[PDB]
Design a protein around this ligand. Structure first.
Ligand SMILES: O=c1[nH]c(=O)n([C@H]2C[C@H](O)[C@@H](CO)O2)cc1-c1ccc(Br)s1
Ligand SMILES: O=c1[nH]c(=O)n([C@H]2C[C@H](O)[C@@H](CO)O2)cc1-c1ccc(Br)s1
Lengths: 300, 304
């Protein structure tokens, strides 16, 4: 069968991502803005930022913020969820690629990365973050995740330039979110280096120290038994997290440059990403139509 | 290679499902109960109490529809968390379909929290079909040998039992009973529909035994203004979800059990249906013990 290349450009918002991918037998699946602002619900992004603002002003409580916050993360990952779902069966085993799919963000941003950041923000229960993790679909072969690198003040400047409507410059949420992708990038090398959280978990009391991995966020008092132990339910959700992330291929793009440069770099990492065969002759065309119809309908 | 026999007992609450499964188990056979301790304490505080009060608040006109949806959606993520973790942990051992070396008697399948309960809440107006389809996209891949025993039981006889089998924080809500009763009937019809060659897209225009009418399946829940494009066709985002709703269920093995009989009767009834069920091999020979302990542990920690 012919081969495919799936590339998910991911990282914190405000790093110039959509811009540089649009500057790129290659389809680009955008961010489903229409689905957030209109299809799934009314102005999901506004809701997120507003709510946290009410929590920051104490106009509402950590728990009401959690439910609203929780209910929104659902609307945000839905389009990505279904795409991976319908896409999954066509992807074959790892292997010029007959089709290159550039996606704007992977599902883990919705089922892991943003949820965690909001936890880090006192707006999402760690119990909920782990519920989402538990739902992270299996990791198809050839899943290349590009995460971005960019100096803080530079990223603050950028965050400032363009924001979806309803947003708010939230410098904490920036640091919260920059923290997560940083930890996530660390977890992957850890898992890949042979690290076992169960074996290293006691330390929280050639590879990253589990203190610099995503595992360190779940030493959360609400996840532990009166004697300090993690409840098994939760220990298992970390076996899923471990399971899902270890197979991903993470590629770093330095965003501290010009779109032309970022673009030129993005295409550059491509030389080492992993391709896979498709399942049917007609997989490529079906995939091509899905990615174009996804774009057409949800990209504003 | 050893085989495994997985059996998920689901259906509307208040039919006596938990009892009989225990009964049956009291006769290489491990149970996986409902994770009440997670619902009452671990994941959140009193989730079931939260659910029945919210609906109730909405009905009293004391909150809105968007408050309920936000709360309900939130409550459902908690309710199905344990099922979701269990399924993902077990999945790698589940192998090809093939007496069983191990029999795992589950209490409710992931789809109950990712589909049926959501769908029913939607029918109650405390959930949106967009949220349902979000959950549906999150239903995990249907493992081989997914045998589901649903429970039949006449309504009045159900009402009486429900009135009896309440949960801590539960309210006698017949409306929800009827809703939950309708949703599970559609599930069975749907699985029959999908298996007799049915295709929703083909029969979309139209909105044991013979193939059911698409309008007697779950696909009919999703004919909502919210999901339609001005051109009148389902938006593709949802259409693609319904594609997964059909993929997930098409390979399940549904069996129906009659709950209009004594506890020792359902036990024997269910014990009868069990023989015609699909087993499967395990991935590693040592997968059985592991599976045995995950189940016992799930039981020991979240059962109550
Ligand atoms: O889950 C989310 N939650 C969230 O608050 N955001 C924010 C960041 C920015 O302000 C705007 C667009 O990225 O919305 C994004 C996401 C995700 C988008 C796509 C996926 Br997958 S997850
Ligand atoms: O999603 C749910 N929603 C819900 O309202 N219930 C109610 C019904 C009854 O009052 C009680 C116990 O099932 O909880 C149960 C569930 C689930 C339990 C297990 C799974 Br999977 S889904």
């Amino acid at each position: 069968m012919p081969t495919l290349l799936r590339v998910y450009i991911d990282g914190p918002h405000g790093m110039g991502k959509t811009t540089t991918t649009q500057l790129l037998d290659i389809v680009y699946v955008p961010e489903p803005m229409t689905y957030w602002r209109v299809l799934g619900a009314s102005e999901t992004i506004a809701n997120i930022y507003t709510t946290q603002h009410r929590l920051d002003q104490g106009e509402i409580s950590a728990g009401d913020a959690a439910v609203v916050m929780t209910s929104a993360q659902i609307t945000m990952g839905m389009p990505y969820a279904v795409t991976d779902a319908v896409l999954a069966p066509h992807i074959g085993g790892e292997a010029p690629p007959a089709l290159t799919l550039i996606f704007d963000r992977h599902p883990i941003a919705a089922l892991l990365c943003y949820p965690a950041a909001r936890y880090l923000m006192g707006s999402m229960t760690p119990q909920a973050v782990l519920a989402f993790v538990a739902l992270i679909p299996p990791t198809l072969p050839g899943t290349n995740i590009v995460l971005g690198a960019l100096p803080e003040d530079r990223h603050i400047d950028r965050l400032a330039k363009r924001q979806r409507p309803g947003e708010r410059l939230d410098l904490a949420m920036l640091a919260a979110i920059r923290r997560v992708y940083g930890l996530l990038a660390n977890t992957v090398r850890y898992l890949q280096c042979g690290g076992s959280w169960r074996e290293d978990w006691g330390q929280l009391s050639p590879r990253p120290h589990i203190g610099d991995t995503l595992f360190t966020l779940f030493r959360a008092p609400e996840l532990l038994a009166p004697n300090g132990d993690l409840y098994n339910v939760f220990a298992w959700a970390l076996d899923v997290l471990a399971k899902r992330l270890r197979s991903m291929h993470v590629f770093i793009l330095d965003y501290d440059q010009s779109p032309a440069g970022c673009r030129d770099a993005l295409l550059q990492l491509t030389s080492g990403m992993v391709q896979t065969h498709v399942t049917t002759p007609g997989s490529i065309p079906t995939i091509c139509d899905l990615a174009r119809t996804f774009a057409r309908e949800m990209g504003e």
